[PDB]
Curated annotation (Swiss-Prot), chains A, B:
GO CC annotations, alphabetized: cytoplasm; cytosol; intracellular membrane-bounded organelle; nucleoplasm; serine/threonine protein kinase complex
Highest rank taxon of the organism: Eukaryota
Reported effect, residue 335 to R: Decreases phosphorylation and kinase activity. Abolishes dimerization
Domain Ubiquitin-like: 289-365
A Pfam family hit: Pkinase
Impact after mutating residue 546 to A: Decreases kinase activity. Reduced phosphorylation of STING1
Name of the protein: Serine/threonine-protein kinase TBK1
Outcome after substituting residue 52 to A: In IIAE8; decreased expression levels
Domain description: Comprises A N-terminal kinase domain, a ubiquitin-like domain and a C-terminal coiled-coil region mediating homodimerization.
Enzyme category, top tier: transferase
Gene3D superfamilies: 1.20.1270.420, Phosphatidylinositol 3-kinase Catalytic Subunit, Chain A, domain 1 (3.10.20.90), Phosphorylase Kinase, domain 1 (3.30.200.20), Transferase(Phosphotransferase) domain 1 (1.10.510.10)
């Protein structure tokens, strides 16, 4: 074998991790402890030979300590070549680029993981600003990832400060492509990339020979837009000031994220934010807590980004901006019961919200049932070419699509299981509004009983005009009360099991966790992703043996069969059942809004008559005489 | 390289899978399709040379098709040696032994996974009984595992019917060690092993030289017992007719599983079940559905194994047998509201129960708060010896213990999060019993109002004895009603936030999912299990190089530090917080049982007076005259 060594460290040249322009990164261990470290060996060191200036540049990075920055442990010299070797912190998981290489993140990172990336990157750059050093060359490849003690990812920076001695091509500022504006540029490109899984500004044949057109895209500067992609060869550029539909981010977050990118992605130094403005808006998002809310009327889940110190007034406002529901009509349901929120109640004392257990929202005004809005992405055509590079690229693509389909499928199941809960709670919450009307009826019933037989007694002792008038008046009330008594039993007949309102259809329509459709999709998805990582190990081998050449061709054909089998099961089973559940949901809503309209009126026809039987009890029942 | 071939198949000798006495199993592919198959090459074929009798014995296994049986595809001859090669179905996951090799199953398989094992093994043997063939040599190594289309494991048999041409040593029947009784023996040993993670009958130094004592254990035949283990060298045998505390199986299942094993684990052919009796009891368990129930009083979760055709009467009975709660006192809570079950309601129409969303049970009779009962298992002492075999054995042991601690930790968090829900539901369910008392009070209030001022009017028109008597009687009621009116406000003061009953302590005591204690435990557990599988790759290498020898020693010492760090965090954080939550839970229960006792009496002091004000309204209020 072949491996370099040091006074305290040693490493094989086969354990290469990073191939830079100035230095190379190797997986190395310590001679004594055996603990793994990152070995940064300086290549091309001869025309410089610094032992005075650069030495102190390494003595400053040593004491530089932060959670969002890869730690530099020591500066040692190679045994033979006497090259300056940096003992860096080893990150077993890799970088942000490695994460984006996964098909599960082909259409953007998970929302929770994205918030971690945002939090760490901002914290890292801010710490570098405190020391004055500017990075600019901030790429997902320069953002390492480690697993913290709590299992959550922690992102760190590393490849910075190499501008004094010497941005990435797809992360270059237009004026830099030819202040701190050029630094904040690549950050937005990184942030968009992490949220989309794709670059913001893409030509047709990629950023290579057609990258001459790519510079025209950036210099085009459409201000508010954050995406410039041509869907055809040397055609027009499709602009967009919003994020793709395939984005895995919630609607609440996109509203806050969009203006951040738009104000850091333009050539104008007068329209672009500074690091203070950038830090302010970013820190604002990171501080906010999440309130899970599922609108039963629209069959849509929502994530309201609000501060803990904000009141319920702003909460109802934010819900309206995402659901188009007036605050005075936003009726809340939680944990099976109705939930009343005070206009000035802080967000710290809000109930425990989860994607699986949120705060349902029901309204009285008619709302169209929308459901989940996603992008219909079909499988890409697989070419019979043997191109190992192309076989690895298309493997990442075709697997990412199925990942998206499996992502939507689990969400479609989420919406249905959430629907069954909200409906089950609602019908029982309606019964609560039925039991109160009964108790608000019996109070009127007893009232007339001690008003009828009290005036029927006064006249049976044996004037007549007043007697007959009240008698007729009380009869027109006890009768009108009689029909309401019966019509409420009709409502109770509706609330009864199998009473044209029961949720028997909800358990007999869409898909259920018993079907295990997501697990079935994952099985095929595992078969594909296994082949994918294998094709990565085939691309690195440049060429394969005859035996491995055939296996590569076999698995490539089985990659299509796996994807096709999964895509069929998704549309013909998961989707179709969802369409059926969505249909009978919009029907039951109308039948429910109609009922609540009845019960409301029938209840209001008890309060107005409660005041009518109050102006008679204090009248003839109590005459006057010395 | 070195690899054998066939007319249609080929395989490397390095891809060995099974090392049997008669044949070897290799990972092989097809020459055309490239699909992977299991290659069974016959070793020691010379003194037999069968081409007539044995050929048909392979022609019968070909048409033999079942889900719980490994499929035999074809019978081909080797190119050079002309050995009889069986093209078997390849099982990438391995066998049941492979599953038990995992530290996560060191103390038994998960309950769901165990039910799959039971279901498949029974279905497999039953199919073999239909064909008449008996296996007897049923070992976890002879039970393969594959992943079905729905993601769930599927277990199959394979190494059977090799008795005609020719049980495992730890799976031998006592009379066989020296009817179909000898067949059902190894099944119970397998079933115990899967549920415990350990053999039922173990000497001290293992089943080797001290296995002479092991035969004394089996021939000891304590009938009802199912375990025989000596904790000391050549000491007494500790018998047990029940399963260990570390068993991951629910209490409901153990009650059904115990008699099954006890009746198939004894030398007596008169006390042992037949295959019909065995199939009946096993199929009975597999057909039953699971009802999740969490007793708030005892802070214990329960899994009631009941049939779908059974009524709620048997349900309440089964709950009593596990919670010691009388059926007439079992008050049910579900989905935030109280749940009323009809005595003859089928189990098919029971609500959706989950371990995370079960049916809570509250009682009126005082119950001691038990909580989770588990076995306190400490880390085993690690010896400084270099023994690779011993280093791999202790790695499986020390990792399995931490797995158990992480298993309990997630359960301790489950019980607490379940506690917070049941309490939150209860306090709101009490308010429901408070709002009814109010409505059952106002009916009495209005009653006396039209009874007081109706008799105060009759006497103010200006006999006297009757007048004064009723007046005093109504005063003793309106007054006694007045104090109840105020004492209920005291209860409402208790139900009010911060009213010596609020669940503010529940969110400020034990551990929460925000702490991520389980994730923290998993991080260290991942570091350990990685080292474990590495030690397996070191044991197979017999000896290691100098470099790898030191790394082995380094990771071995870091294996202790990982386990110690995890075990400390478990006891000092996860456990201690659980003890505090358990303490303040037992206190709040008494304060809740006391309140419900008050509200009950205060409610009963409204019904008995409702009938008192009913015998006066139909009296003097309605006199008599012509
Ligand atoms: O600082 C740079 N590159 C960063 C990307 C590669 N460098 C590293 N990679 C890693 N880990 C890593 C990189 C790529 C893939 C993986 C995942 N596997 C781990 C071991 O097995 C193979 C890959 C791990 N750790 C630390 C570092 C150095 C300290 C910043 C510049 C590029 C040359 C210097
Ligand atoms: O039938 C037997 N042995 C069963 C155990 C090994 N045989 C098999 N193993 C397997 N798969 C397997 C066995 C052990 C480990 C693993 C997991 N990895 C898969 C590939 O990489 C290494 C191990 C897989 N499939 C099929 C079979 C034969 C058809 C029953 C007798 C023992 C000689 C015949």
């Amino acid at each position: 074998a072949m491996g370099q060594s040091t006074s305290n460290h040693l490493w094989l040249l086969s354990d290469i991790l990073g191939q830079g322009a100035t230095a190379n990164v190797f997986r190395g261990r310590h001679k004594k402890t055996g603990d793994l470290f990152a070995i940064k060996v300086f290549n091309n060191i001869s025309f410089l030979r610094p032992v005075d200036v650069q030495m102190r540049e390494f003595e400053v990075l040593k004491k530089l300590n932060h959670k969002n920055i890869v730690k530099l442990f020591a500066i040692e010299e190679e045994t033979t070549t006497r090259h300056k070797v940096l003992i860096m912190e080893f990150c077993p998981c890799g970088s942000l680029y490695t994460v984006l290489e996964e098909p599960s993140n082909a259409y953007g990172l998970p929302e929770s993981e994205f918030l971690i990336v945002l939090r760490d990157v901002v914290g890292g750059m801010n710490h570098l600003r405190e020391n004055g050093i500017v990075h600019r060359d901030i790429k997902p490849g320069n953002i390492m990832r480690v697993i913290g003690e709590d299992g959550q990812s922690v992102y760190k920076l590393t490849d910075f400060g190499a501008a004094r001695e010497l941005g990435t091509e797809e992360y270059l500022h237009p004026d830099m492509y030819e202040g701190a504006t050029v630094d904040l540029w690549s950050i937005g490109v990184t942030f968009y990339h992490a949220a989309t899984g794709s670059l913001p500004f893409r030509p047709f044949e990629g950023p290579r020979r057609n990258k001459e057109v790519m510079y025209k895209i950036i210099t085009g500067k459409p201000s508010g837009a954050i995406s410039g992609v041509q869907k055809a060869e040397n055609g027009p550029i499709d602009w967009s000031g919003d994020m793709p539909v395939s984005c895995s981010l919630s609607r609440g977050l996109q509203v806050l994220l969009t203006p951040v990118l738009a104000n850091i992605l333009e050539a104008d130094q007068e329209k672009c934010w500074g690091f203070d403005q950038f830090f302010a808006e970013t820190s604002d998002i990171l501080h906010r807590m999440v309130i899970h809310v599922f609108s039963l009327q629209q069959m849509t889940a929502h994530k309201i980004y609000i501060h803990s110190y904000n009141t319920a007034t702003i909460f109802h406002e934010l819900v309206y901006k995402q659901t188009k529901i007036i605050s005075s009509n936003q009726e809340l349901i939680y944990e099976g019961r109705r939930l009343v929120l005070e206009p000035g109640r802080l967000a710290q004392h809000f109930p425990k919200t989860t994607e699986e257990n949120p705060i349902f929202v029901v309204s009285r005004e008619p709302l169209n049932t929308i459901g989940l809005i996603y992008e219909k992405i079909s499988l890409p055509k697989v070419h019979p070419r043997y191109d190992l590079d192309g076989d690895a690229s298309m493997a990442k693509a075709i697997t990412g699509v199925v990942c998206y389909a499996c992502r939507i499928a689990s969400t479609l199941l989420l919406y249905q299981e959430l629907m069954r809960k909200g409906i089950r709670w609602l019908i029982e919450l309606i019964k609560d509004d039925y039991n109160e009307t009964v108790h608000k009826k019996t109070e009127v019933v007893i009232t007339l009983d001690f008003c009828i037989r009290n005036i029927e007694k006064t006249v049976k002792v044996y004037e007549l005009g007043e007697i007959s008038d009240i008698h007729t008046k009380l009869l027109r009330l006890s009768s009108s009360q009689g029909t309401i008594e019966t019509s409420l039993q009709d409502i109770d007949s509706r609330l009864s099991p199998g009473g044209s309102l029961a949720d028997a259809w909800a358990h007999q329509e869409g898909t259920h966790p018993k079907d295990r459709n997501v697990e079935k999709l994952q099985v095929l998805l595992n078969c594909m992703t296994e082949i994918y990582y294998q094709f990565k190990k085939d691309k690195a081998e440049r060429r394969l043996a005859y035996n491995e050449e055939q296996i590569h061709k076999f698995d490539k054909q089985k990659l299509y069969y796996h994807a096709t089998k999964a895509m069929t099961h998704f549309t013909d089973e998961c989707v179709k059942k969802y369409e059926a559940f969505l249909n009978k949901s919009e029907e039951w809503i109308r039948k429910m809004l109609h009922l609540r309209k009845q019960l409301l009126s029938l209840t209001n026809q008890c309060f107005d008559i409660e005041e009518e039987v109050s102006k008679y009890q204090e009248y003839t029942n109590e005459l006057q005489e010395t």
